[PDB]
Design a protein around this nucleic acid. Structure first.
Lengths: 102, 60, 121, 415, 51, 27, 136, 225
RNA sequence: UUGAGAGAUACAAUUUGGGAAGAAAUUCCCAGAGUGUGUUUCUUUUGCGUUUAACCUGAACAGUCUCAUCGUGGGCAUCUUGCGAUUC
């Protein structure tokens, strides 16, 4: 949700390596037969290959992320375009006032 | 035809002509830009070899 | 001090302080941070020299903020004591503005040092 | 083994190798331009033209451990290029603290410092040590003894790791050795009569060899135990082997190989021994050893074709008479060529394209006409060798073997 | 915007009409401004409260 | 295309003449 | 020092009038516009109204081309030119005030103290060179 | 007193006593930086070709300026609201500007004007790591570049390969001194348009904006793929 | 006479395109490109370019004392008629 603690926590884990508790939740909710994963950033190598997940992020993963980032709001959530921009700017102002002190 | 062959050669080879206030440049080809490194800057190559053939070292 | 951007090396700081000494002899510099900011406001400064040696450096790093508005070059030298020696007073000098002139004898030296400054911006 | 040709108005001023242990060899080279060019050794083409983001490159050097690359440019910049991303991918890293005069030669101390000789007669020392407070700013500046009646340029700079010195040759002919810490001269020799273009050293830095436009190779030695405990090079020896200049010198030293290699304005290579330079022997290579030919004849019409850079020429025996030539300037670079038996069609071919020309002897001249084939115009050719009067076999630069005028099955090799 | 002003401006900061009339005719400028009500200037007495 | 091109030229002249100059441009 | 203050505040008045007068004008652009095209015929042709769309009104001044009033003949034009002339004479007043304050400041700097000599150039533009001696 | 429109809606020319360029408001009532405000019932903020850089390209004539009132735009180099205010005015309340900068000294006033306009969302991270704001927004319709760093082509190439949809616009402002001084603007701008068409940016136009900036250019291109 | 190469700059016709008038012939407005005839700008190019030079600097104004500033008187109106600037 719009909880500032969870938002800024995943924001710090996105601006750093991506081994957050939500990524541990993803490792819980995708453990079927040590499946293949497409990470976004190559610097998240720890949660990319930590435990039973064949990860791949190179030079076409960016193309499929272009596709799924082009059409995040139209089918993935039950949300709308102004709602995605509002939650993005809430997260943005939170992380901005966190890094830039006041 | 003897006094303008280089003129018609260069005026047919060269690009980026003027159109009033404007200038219509050609973009180059991935063919040449991926087969060869770009040409040397003749200013600096002439500076280096003109230095090594300066008059103060008496070449012969 | 980390937050004193462009800092000069030894050769550039030697020729900066040489042109400061001959501008001080020609009465063409304003020594002191308030006089430097006055020349910044009036637009009659060629370049600003500051000292990365003051124990609050925040009494300095405000004239960068109106140097980058009037695109006047500014530079840091490591010693306020040596800047005061170069300016030719008995006190340490924190900042010094070399003022503008067009009939000046040392105009070529000022222009050479300010071009060497704006190479490192 | 191989030759990688460049075309019209292309030159090459510096080149450096890079071999991280376990990965392929990588070959970067500057020309007279604003880019670095990394070549893949398979095809013989550039696989990367990284435009360095400041000015015309004057020198190139490779880091020790070979993850970074210094390019020293005409506007006084030293630009670091991150090399360790894999073969082919080059990133910009950091522009070091600028200056006025162009930096003409570079060297690294280790992963830590980068030394650069400039065209104002000075030798700067920058710190390329990442995560230090003084990263990128130039720590020291040294000034060599200027010429009286002309400007002085420091042409060659090396670091000597056994001691802690920088050796430097400049355009007065003087060769100076500088203590790195304290950044200051230990001793200067007045060795050459004109500029010192290139100088190098051996493994344990008991010798420093040096050469330039006055065409002698000087050897500075520190091999005595007293020399090593006193840090005193002596001007040991001096040899005259080259004809015009020496623009490049390098040294290799292993268990069954210890030679310094040198070449210059005269086009030949010269091999000398490293630890036996003055005593031992030397070998001046031939100026060309045609492992790739530029001339072939055809017995009918008693004629011979020969191609230099981007032009072919044909003459007949009789005396002899130049019957035709093709200075094709739509081309930029040439490579190998073959004629049909009966002397009908010539085919010229470079690694980017190839082109086929019908020929008709009209008497004391020929008539030459292009015959269009876009498969030939698109293919890369190394070798064309004419099965028939019409059929040729084509070896492509990407290991394809066609048969035109189609595909030979070719098994794979154990890597 | 107050921090990037020189100390002479911070001296005369309240007394703009007296300042600019005493500059636009060639008279003597004020010396106190808005800073006159500081406790230290209250402790001073004479011409040294200008000082 | 007469009623479109003529009216477009008339509207373009009636706009562009009211911000332009002939002898004041060099001045 | 107080008539130097008078000339300096007059100069600062004209400086501020200059900058916030030139902030509210509009200057005709003069930039080398370049257009990149395909093989050779697109360069050989006229760039056929690719962004002009009239070759009479909306081609040759670029402050606003287009894709399709109180005496607009000379009154607005003379008002425009007169506001440009106002900014130009603000500039002339400011540079004359800068020069006269510079001479006033040189005289004031000259009559302070220290040793100095009258340096004369080729022309007769005199300057005063001060002895290398720091202030006690 | 008479407002005429421009080639791009949200950009107008206020003719009359001063025939000067102008945009709309999304800030109701007030200026942000002391730019002049013209009312014609309806509020308008004057753009300046000297105070800002995109306005100089408009005044020099940019036909397919891909900043346009039905899009969303990514601004890599503002440092303060003095240009992205006008970009939010021209893009209107339908879209969104992502003003991404690194130096957090004028990022204070960047975030301060992003408080007033919901059009403007700020990013306070350096534009050579777009992965650090992967998780904020993607798939912009036009990038803008005003970075004065030497790796302009590589920075906007990374940002356009991560966040620009196909066939969109690229507008890059190139300062000649931040790449190479002592050599003229013609060679350094030809070098940079070749460096940018090395990526999938077909160059469309460059112009030099000479009465407003010394030795600058604005290059537009379309992102191929 | 830069030996050669490239840019602006006058004259002439021949033209390329967007609009408006006409039956077309063609006209009219606008914006442009190119070739011949003059000036001129930039890069090599040789006798040699000057092979030294320029500038700064050391205790470098001042006994016929030098300089500054405020005044006083006088010359120059057959004109240094004098600028918040030295007219002698």
């Amino acid at each position: 949700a719009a909880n500032a603690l969870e938002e800024a926590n995943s924001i710090i884990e996105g601006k750093v390596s991506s081994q957050l508790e939500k990524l541990l939740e993803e490792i819980k909710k995708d453990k079927k037969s040590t499946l293949i994963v497409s990470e976004t950033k190559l610097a998240n190598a720890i949660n990319k290959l930590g435990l039973n997940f064949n990860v791949v992020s190179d030079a076409v993963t960016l193309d499929i992320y272009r596709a799924i980032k082009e059409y995040l709001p139209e089918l993935l959530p039950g949300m709308s375009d102004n709602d995605l921009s509002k939650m993005s700017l809430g997260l943005a102002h939170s992380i901005g006032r966190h890094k830039l002190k006041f | 035809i003897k006094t303008k062959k280089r003129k018609t050669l260069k005026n047919l080879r060269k690009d980026s002509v003027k159109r009033g206030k404007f200038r219509v440049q050609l973009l180059s080809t991935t063919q040449d830009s991926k087969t060869l490194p770009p040409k040397k800057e003749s200013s600096i190559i002439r500076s280096k070899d003109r230095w090594l053939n300066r008059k103060a070292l008496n070449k012969g | 001090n980390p937050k004193a951007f462009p800092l000069a090396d030894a050769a550039l700081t030697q020729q900066i302080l040489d042109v400061v000494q001959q501008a001080a002899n020609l009465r063409q510099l304003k020594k002191g941070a308030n006089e430097a900011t006055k020349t910044l406001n009036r637009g009659i400064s060629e370049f600003i020299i500051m000292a990365a040696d003051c124990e609050p450096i925040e009494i300095l790093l405000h004239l960068p903020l109106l140097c980058e508005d009037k695109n006047v070059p500014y530079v840091f030298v490591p010693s306020r004591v040596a800047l005061g020696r170069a300016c030719g007073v008995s006190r340490p000098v924190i900042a010094a503005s070399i003022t503008t002139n067009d009939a000046s004898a040392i105009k070529t030296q000022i222009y050479a040092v300010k071009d060497k400054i704006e190479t490192l911006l | 083994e191989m030759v990688i040709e460049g075309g019209k108005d292309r030159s090459i001023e510096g080149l450096c190798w890079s071999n991280v242990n376990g990965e392929s060899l990588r070959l970067f080279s500057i020309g007279g331009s604003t880019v670095v060019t990394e070549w893949d050794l398979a095809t013989g083409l550039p696989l990367r033209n990284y435009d360095c983001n400041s000015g015309v490159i004057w020198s190139i050097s490779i880091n020790d451990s070979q993850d970074k690359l210094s390019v020293g440019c005409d506007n006084g910049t030293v630009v670091l290029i991150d090399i360790s991303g894999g073969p082919g991918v080059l990133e910009h890293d950091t522009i070091l603290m600028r200056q006025e005069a162009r930096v003409l030669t570079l060297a690294w101390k280790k992963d830590d410092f980068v030394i650069g000789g400039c065209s104002d007669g000075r030798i700067r020392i920058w710190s390329a040590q990442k995560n230090d407070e003084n990263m990128g700013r130039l720590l020291h500046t040294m000034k060599v003894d200027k010429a009286k009646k002309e400007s002085t340029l420091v042409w060659s700079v090396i670091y000597l790791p056994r001691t802690d010195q920088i050796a430097s040759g400049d355009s007065t002919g003087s060769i100076k050795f500088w203590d790195f810490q304290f950044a200051t001269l230990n001793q200067s020799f007045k060795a050459h009569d004109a500029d010192v273009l290139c100088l190098t050293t051996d493994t344990d830095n008991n010798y420093v060899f040096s050469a330039g436009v006055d065409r002698k190779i000087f050897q500075f030695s520190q091999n005595t135990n007293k020399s090593q405990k006193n840090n005193r090079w002596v001007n040991s020896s001096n040899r005259l082997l080259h004809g015009n200049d020496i623009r490049a010198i390098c040294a290799y030293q292993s268990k069954g190989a210890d030679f310094l290699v040198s070449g210059g304005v005269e086009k030949t290579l010269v091999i000398n021994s490293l630890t036996s330079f003055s005593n031992g022997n030397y070998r001046k290579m031939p100026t060309v050893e045609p492992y790739s030919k530029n001339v072939l004849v055809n017995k009918e019409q008693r004629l011979v074709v020969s191609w230099s850079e981007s032009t072919v020429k044909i003459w007949t025996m009789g005396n002899y008479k130049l019957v035709c030539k093709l200075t094709l300037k739509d081309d930029q670079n040439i490579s190998t060529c073959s004629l049909s038996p009966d002397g009908q069609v010539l085919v010229v071919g470079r690694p980017s394209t190839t082109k086929v020309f019908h020929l008709q002897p009209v008497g004391n001249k020929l008539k030459v006409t292009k015959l269009d084939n876009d498969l030939l115009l698109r293919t890369s050719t190394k070798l064309v060798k004419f099965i028939d009067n019409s059929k040729i076999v084509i070896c492509s630069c990407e290991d394809d073997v066609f048969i035109v005028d189609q595909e030979v099955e070719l098994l794979e090799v154990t890597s | 915007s107050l921090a990037k002003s020189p100390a002479s401006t911070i001296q005369i900061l309240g007394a703009e009409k007296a300042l600019f009339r005493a500059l636009k005719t060639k008279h003597d400028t004020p010396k106190y401004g808005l800073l006159y009500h500081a406790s230290l200037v209250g402790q001073a007495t004479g011409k040294n409260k200008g000082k | 295309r007469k009623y479109l091109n003529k009216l477009i030229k008339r509207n373009s002249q009636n706009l562009r003449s009211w911000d332009l100059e002939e002898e004041v441009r060099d001045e | 020092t107080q008539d130097s203050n008078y000339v300096r505040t007059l100069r600062q008045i004209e400086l501020k009038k200059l900058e916030k007068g030139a902030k509210q004008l509009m200057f005709k652009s003069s930039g080398n516009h370049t257009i990149f095209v395909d093989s050779r015929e697109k360069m050989n042709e006229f760039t056929p109204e690719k962004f002009f769309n009239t070759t009479s009104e909306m081609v040759n001044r670029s402050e606003n081309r287009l894709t399709k009033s109180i005496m607009p003949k000379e009154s607005l034009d003379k008002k425009k030119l007169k506001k440009f002339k106002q900014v130009k004479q603000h500039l002339q007043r400011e540079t004359q005030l800068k020069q006269v304050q510079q001479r006033m400041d040189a005289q004031r700097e000259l009559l302070k103290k220290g040793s100095k000599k009258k340096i004369v150039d080729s022309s007769g533009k005199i300057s005063f060179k001060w002895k290398k001696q720091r202030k006690r | 007193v008479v407002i005429e429109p421009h080639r791009h809606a949200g950009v107008y020319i206020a003719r009359g006593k001063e025939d000067l360029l102008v945009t709309k408001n999304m800030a109701p009532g007030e200026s942000v930086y002391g730019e002049k405000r013209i009312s014609v019932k309806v509020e308008y903020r004057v753009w300046n070709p000297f105070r800002s850089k995109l306005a100089a390209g408009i005044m020099g004539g940019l036909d397919e300026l891909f900043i346009a009132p039905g899009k969303k735009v990514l601004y890599l180099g503002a440092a303060s609201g003095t240009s992205v205010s006008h970009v939010s005015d021209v893009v209107g309340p339908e879209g969104v500007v992502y003003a991404v900068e690194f130096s957090h000294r004028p990022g204070r006033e960047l975030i301060s004007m992003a408080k007033k306009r919901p059009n403007i969302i700020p990013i306070i991270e350096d534009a050579r790591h777009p992965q650090k704001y992967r998780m904020l927004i993607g798939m912009v319709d036009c990038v803008f570049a005003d970075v004065a760093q030497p790796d302009q082509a590589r920075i906007i190439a990374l940002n356009s390969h991560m966040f620009l949809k196909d066939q969109g616009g690229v507008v890059i402002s190139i300062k000649a001194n931040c790449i190479d001084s002592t050599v003229d603007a013609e060679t350094v701008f030809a070098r940079e348009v070749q460096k940018l068409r090395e990526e999938r940016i077909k160059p469309l136009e460059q112009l030099t904006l000479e009465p407003y900036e010394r030795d600058h250019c604005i290059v537009v291109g379309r992102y191929m793929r």
